[PDB]
Amino acid sequence: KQTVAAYIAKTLESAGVKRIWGVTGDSLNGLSDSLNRMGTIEWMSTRHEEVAAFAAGAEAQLSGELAVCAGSCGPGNLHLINGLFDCHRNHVPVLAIAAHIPSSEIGSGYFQETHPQELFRECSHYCELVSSPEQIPQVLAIAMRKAVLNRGVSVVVLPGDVALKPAPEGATMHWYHAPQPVVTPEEEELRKLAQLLRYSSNIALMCGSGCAGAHKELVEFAGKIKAPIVHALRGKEHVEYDNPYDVGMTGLIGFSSGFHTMMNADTLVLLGTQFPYRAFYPTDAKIIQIDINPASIGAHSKVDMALVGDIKSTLRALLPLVEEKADRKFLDKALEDYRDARKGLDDLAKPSEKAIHPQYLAQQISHFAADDAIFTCDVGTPTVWAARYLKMNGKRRLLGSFNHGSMANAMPQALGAQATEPERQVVAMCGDGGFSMLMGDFLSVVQMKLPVKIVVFNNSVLGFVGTELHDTNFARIAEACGITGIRVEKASEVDEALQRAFSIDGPVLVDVVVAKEELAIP
Amino acid sequence: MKQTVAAYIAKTLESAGVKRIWGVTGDSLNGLSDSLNRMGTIEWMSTRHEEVAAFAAGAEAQLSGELAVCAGSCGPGNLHLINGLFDCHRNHVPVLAIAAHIPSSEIGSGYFQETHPQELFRECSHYCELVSSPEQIPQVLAIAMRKAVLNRGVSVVVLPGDVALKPAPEGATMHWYHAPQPVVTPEEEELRKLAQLLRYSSNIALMCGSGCAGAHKELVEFAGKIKAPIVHALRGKEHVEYDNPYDVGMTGLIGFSSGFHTMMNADTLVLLGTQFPYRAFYPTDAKIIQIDINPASIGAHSKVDMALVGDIKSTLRALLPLVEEKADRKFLDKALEDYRDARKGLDDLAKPSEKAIHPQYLAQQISHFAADDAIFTCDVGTPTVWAARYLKMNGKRRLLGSFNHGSMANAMPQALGAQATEPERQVVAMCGDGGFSMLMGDFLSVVQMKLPVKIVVFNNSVLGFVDGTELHDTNFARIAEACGITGIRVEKASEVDEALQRAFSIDGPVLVDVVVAKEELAIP
Amino acid sequence: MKQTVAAYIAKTLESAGVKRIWGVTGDSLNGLSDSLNRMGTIEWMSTRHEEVAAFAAGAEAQLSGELAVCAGSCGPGNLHLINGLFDCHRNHVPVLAIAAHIPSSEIGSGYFQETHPQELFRECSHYCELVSSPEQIPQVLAIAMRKAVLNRGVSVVVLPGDVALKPAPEGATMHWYHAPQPVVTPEEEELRKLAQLLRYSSNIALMCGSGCAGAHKELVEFAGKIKAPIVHALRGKEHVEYDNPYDVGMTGLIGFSSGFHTMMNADTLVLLGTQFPYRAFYPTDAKIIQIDINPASIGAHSKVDMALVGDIKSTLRALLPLVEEKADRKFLDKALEDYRDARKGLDDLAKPSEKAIHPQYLAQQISHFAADDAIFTCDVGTPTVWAARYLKMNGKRRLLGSFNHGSMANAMPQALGAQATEPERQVVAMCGDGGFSMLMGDFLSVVQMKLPVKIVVFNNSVLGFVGTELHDTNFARIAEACGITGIRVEKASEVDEALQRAFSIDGPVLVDVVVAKEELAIPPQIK
């Protein structure tokens, strides 16, 4: 004998969830009451539910495990929506509990009435209203299983009255963790691919986050066929380290070596990528794509050969079939292009008496941040600088809103990262627009005591792609909130400001006045 | 080489091997019709109601294992597809629907025939998008086709008639690379855990669904190794219920005692590739193990103590060598004995009589006289019960229905698709009188398309599965004759054998209108 | 009152005056069937396809002016209603759809027959909600019924079969108060402005749609006062094209020259209760004034220089005394002359011949021999063209079609609803061969319900309006096999007697008329 809400909480507990992110409301009484009497799952109270969703997404990204957020009826859960798009687009396992108005009032135009079970369809792969307690075991099981195994958001919509009703007595709360299966293409398909590669030249690999966990195989594959690698942004943390074949990125924020290697390839292998910018794929090259998701195949380019498979096990099965190629002209030219490009990048990142080049600031962040720091970066120029200047190493992490493309993601994600890894350094590279767009949750940094290092790229503008922001002193604002604030205006002050911020035993905001820059590198 | 968006679509489908498109025309489909006529390779199959086009395409996809296509004109045209598309999607068969749409310039104004197909079809598809711009078509079509084929379901492309007539992007490619399913099998560690669990479990039953298609050999070997009786969900019947000494029937209301009891009494239950939806028929204190390729199926209709994601064939192949042979066969032997009793009860109901024709007799005789490799379709209603209980399967015969979506009137439309896909093969539609008359207009398609379907109407002059249950008494044989198809009216049990034999021999379509009694479901 | 949710619904409908519910049963409808049986007042009308139940309910609501109801079982059952509900909603007729739903405990699990009707029906309704809890039903049903009747369109109530069987709330009331439409008239200032504008406008035409229903007298008086020819949109035909010396026909592709030119050449155009959707047929150079009760109609298919919200009857009554009589009638006289030419062209196409039966001859003869108060329905396709051009209206006859939603196969199903609603009245369905065969199963409903519909099939063995070839079918033979009289007509000389026979027979009849391919154009009259 327990409530529907208790059944949910116990089942989550069994699946190993550690916390739920949200803001309360009366519609969530059943859930709050369960959490209080359970005393194991921790409630993380944010100032805006949007931030709860972002934070849960960051937690799921880092842990590889189901994360949970919740919102009260109407406006409460509606506030989650932009953060849930980010979670879903980032392919991270997140369950959203959307509390709903009393079921008796549905359809009458009631106080706070919305229809969450319709609103959230696009940003989830499962979304249903629990009208009856008898639904909860099936609805919760499918929701959790899809969130974890399909890697995305599931939404359970729970009227507050239904939450307080008795759960079905025979229902079980134990959760069996089923890992991903091994997914690899048919042997014949691998043989066909190997044969194709045998007779292809000037091959480049475009690698995305689907290569996570396959570093060793990827590097061995590139070396075997002599293929330079370019990586999509979400592949950066997984691909751009211990990798003599990596030659950068394309797209507008990429650089010349990535751009040319991609354009000039005669054969292109897309490995676990969704890189969306169609005009950056070459016009006449064979294109081969390997992905676990049929929906990704052909999404942003023609495809001459498609294979469904997980990158790690596909490459393991493929490697022994692939003959080593001696011809390395294309690779050598790409590497030479890369050397030139990096040098161009580096020339932009120097100290000056004029104004602080944000690329200098980003470079120094990378230089002084921990060996295993977790970085988040706001959509806007901070994404450009992170892409171009953060050095990855297989331990560091980079989170952003790279697919959904939302401003204001950095600090909220940092919040989730820091709570998930309390001992780890977390550095939020924020825009002034981004930081102020969800500024209220700066107070969460204090309230939750999460030592997040916030660095604001204060260009007092909405700089990426004019439209001015009033000269704001964020350091002063931090101090007023009870967090250490450091105002940086001279390039010579940068090094010491970052070192101080990182050493302080607590959260810090470094407010750096930076120059407006350009995207292209001459 | 300039070409229209519609031509680009048609060429791409041609390259993917599509042979026909099912629909009814309209002006909003001019682009498409024009290019099908120019191309002269994909055949246009014109039905009387677009709902039937969708059912038929689903039957084609079910039988061929390959992408099938249907189309509808703007507004009401494509809207007519919807019930059939639910059936396709629920049956997990690869179908592309081209929904022609009003001219894009009139969208949002309350125009003649305005609907929003890109919203309507969300639920019965895994991909559904409006093509506003010619520049979309290569990506939209690629994703639509790839998802339909590999995710096994319906994709919808909504195409305003004016956009269809615009130039396709010049660099777009129309060649289609056929990517087969991957091999999907659980990690080794998980298989060893399962093997260990089975080693310490007793009284194991297997509940097998259509996910076992292609895995017959492994399934039977597995059951024999651990001594587990098999019960099958309805959509597993054609794949599981033959050359199988472990099979003990079905549960659910249309199942029977042996299936019922074996399921209820098991201490360990292994769900293999099944979505069997009737929650109260799963046992209450059993360990439940479920193997499925689709995370959404896991735990959908029962608790799950151990879940594994994997394809049945490849999972059982990897699992078998890890599983120790069990000597204890009491549970299996008792299930088999139950089964012997149940099958005798079933047989007692299927006898000729002077009173009235027992539909179960009729079904039994259909099974007896139909070809070794006949394709059967059956209407939702009593014909589904009789098919389930009396059609003998053998690894060549096929059974199609609307088993998940549960729509009346599916049998003849599916038969239409089956017959066109396999022109040399015998196709037998087991129809209800409600079902047949609900989409009766496409009976004319049987003549127009010259598809020798054998239609057998279970004429109980009622909506018998379930006020408004009485249908005015109707002679469907007479209606057939008036349409130019042979009609045989059967009212005495003694006439059944010869009526079926004549129908099956006739070189053309035939409707056999059999007056059958009302029957109870339970069996004494 | 101890009763179930379904019983509460049935009693409330009974109190609102509903006489019948159209549908096909299913187990998910047990609660409702149960209640209807026990009540014995509302009649269940069983069709062969639920799509037909929806069309038929729409026809009933169109003719009676009152709430009509249809129902469907869970999943495929109610899903089958959808195309007919689009027609109802687009025709602005009050219809409640009861969509039975799977047991609420199975929702979200991928259950047998699972759909989400509360999402599917959003576009073709102005109210659509799931009843999860018995406590909802009084509010949900009250809003559903009120919106259907007063907003004139479809409301959908989605009702899981288990919830249907639960107790209704004990204090709920089942009595229904009928609230009529309010009087809606523009503010006096706006009428004054309009009158002033008309005073200084010339060459004025009126484009009149079904919003003019009930305003014939005022409309004709208004046109005469300012000397404005009237053209009518198709759905205005039955309301406007009779006892009207100002009416000069229709535009659009199926309209004719006089309508076309009057519309194109006007310097001032007044849209009265119309949604005429074909944008290119509005004049490019004229002042446009639109009066409508629905803000969503204003400017939907043309620019608008002056807009007024009001009901046509009230608005014209308040406007007339403000409007000065105009002496200048050149524009009107020219339109009337154009009209005389156009009707003559129309008439020349409607002659008997030994070659083949011109469908326009067939339509003309239907109009000539049908009752003076017949109800006509016509399939989307050529029958709509012929009805538009050849049916003579008179203020008693009615014309139903699928004119906005534009669905094939509407004619016979609408005829079914019309005949049941008016059992003593002659109902003539002008069907296409495509239309008739597309929902042919419900031909059996004509027998089962014993509705004496007169079906006339324009058998051109093609999908003629717009892969169009249909195998030669003999529908008369099919009728006979179904137990209905069938008359096969192949010579023009046989038409007159075939129609007279069909209309006299005390029962339903199908007249299968082999007709020729035609064109929309009408050759000009001497100039």
Ligand SMILES: Cc1cc2nc3c(=O)[nH]c(=O)nc-3n(C[C@H](O)[C@H](O)[C@H](O)COP(=O)(O)OP(=O)(O)OC[C@H]3O[C@@H](n4cnc5c(N)ncnc54)[C@H](O)[C@@H]3O)c2cc1C
């Ligand atoms: C302001 C801004 C500018 C940007 N500009 C650029 C730019 O110039 N260049 C750039 O590159 N990015 C840019 N982006 C980021 C860009 O939008 C995309 O987010 C990114 O390029 C996609 O990276 P990915 O392909 O790894 O994406 P993901 O979305 O992470 O794709 C993962 C892919 O791998 C597949 N996959 C996952 N797991 C496996 C597996 N085990 N085996 C096989 N396949 C698997 C998935 O199905 C999916 O297709 C920008 C972002 C922002 C905010």
Ligand SMILES: Cc1cc2nc3c(=O)[nH]c(=O)nc-3n(C[C@H](O)[C@H](O)[C@H](O)COP(=O)(O)OP(=O)(O)OC[C@H]3O[C@@H](n4cnc5c(N)ncnc54)[C@H](O)[C@@H]3O)c2cc1C
């Ligand atoms: C009137 C009527 C009465 C009915 N009553 C009954 C009844 O009493 N009993 C009954 O059993 N049915 C009954 N049904 C049918 C029932 O509703 C379901 O259709 C049926 O039980 C489900 O069968 P299944 O599990 O094969 O379904 P499917 O939907 O075919 O299930 C397939 C499952 O296998 C998975 N899968 C697919 N491919 C693979 C693979 N390669 N490897 C691993 N997994 C895979 C899928 O993800 C899915 O979960 C009735 C139907 C009707 C119309």
Ligand SMILES: Cc1cc2nc3c(=O)[nH]c(=O)nc-3n(C[C@H](O)[C@H](O)[C@H](O)COP(=O)(O)OP(=O)(O)OC[C@H]3O[C@@H](n4cnc5c(N)ncnc54)[C@H](O)[C@@H]3O)c2cc1C
């Ligand atoms: C094959 C085919 C071809 C067609 N071609 C043509 C054609 O060539 N020409 C043609 O005219 N039609 C044609 N149509 C029909 C056409 O599509 C439109 O449905 C029709 O023109 C609309 O007529 P209406 O304005 O009366 O429409 P309705 O939809 O009946 O619009 C009524 C309008 O009045 C408003 N209203 C209602 N009540 C009141 C009131 N009391 N006071 C004020 N306003 C009120 C409503 O809000 C609405 O704006 C065709 C149909 C078909 C099937």
Ligand SMILES: Cc1ncc(C[n+]2csc(CCOP(=O)(O)OP(=O)(O)O)c2C)c(N)n1
């Ligand atoms: C919520 C949201 N609003 C608007 C945009 C459009 N947009 C993208 S980048 C950007 C500028 C971001 O400003 P800031 O955070 O200050 O970053 P900057 O580029 O200035 O460094 C805007 C307005 C967006 N991506 N998301």
Ligand SMILES: Cc1ncc(C[n+]2csc(CCOP(=O)(O)OP(=O)(O)O)c2C)c(N)n1
């Ligand atoms: C489109 C549709 N309408 C209604 C139902 C509910 N229903 C299920 S079986 C049935 C009666 C079936 O009639 P018939 O085709 O004659 O089969 P039988 O009478 O032999 O059971 C009905 C009305 C349904 N499943 N699908």
Ligand SMILES: Cc1ncc(C[n+]2csc(CCOP(=O)(O)OP(=O)(O)O)c2C)c(N)n1
């Ligand atoms: C359900 C539906 N499908 C398709 C269309 C497109 N369409 C419009 S008219 C027509 C021809 C109708 O054929 P028929 O009923 O025989 O009429 P006619 O031949 O007299 O034009 C078609 C197929 C439609 N409007 N509605």
Ligand SMILES: [Mg+2]
């Ligand atoms: Mg900025």
Ligand SMILES: [Mg+2]
């Ligand atoms: Mg029957």
Ligand SMILES: [Mg+2]
């Ligand atoms: Mg025709």
